[PDB]
């Protein structure tokens, strides 16, 4: 077969990699954005709190 043989392998692989990453790879790294942003926000709040 010239071109048509790849149609089944990629469809299964994409759906697996997205659901697998969504449950075991993506969540641990994105939490750090909520944290890093809060490290600065707590520092900015401390400046207003000390003056008050």
């Amino acid at each position: 077969m010239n071109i048509n043989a790849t149609l089944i392998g990629q469809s299964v692989a994409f759906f697996i990699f997205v659901l697998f990453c969504m449950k075991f790879v993506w969540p641990p790294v994105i939490a750090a954005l909520q944290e890093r942003q809060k490290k600065i926000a707590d520092g900015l709040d401390a400046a207003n709190r000390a003056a008050r």
């Binding site: 401390a46 400046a47 709190r49 000390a50």
Partner: protein, 52 residues
Amino acid sequence: DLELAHEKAGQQLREAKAQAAEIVEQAKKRANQIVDEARDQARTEGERLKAQ
């Protein structure tokens, strides 16, 4: 700086307790003086046993 600010506020706080205590202590000392001067005046006013 926030931790150092709590210590500095702690100096103004203890100074306010001490200064307020001295203001009331001086008032009681002044009150005692007024009564003692009134007793010496009232004792001296007794010249009336001869003067009048």
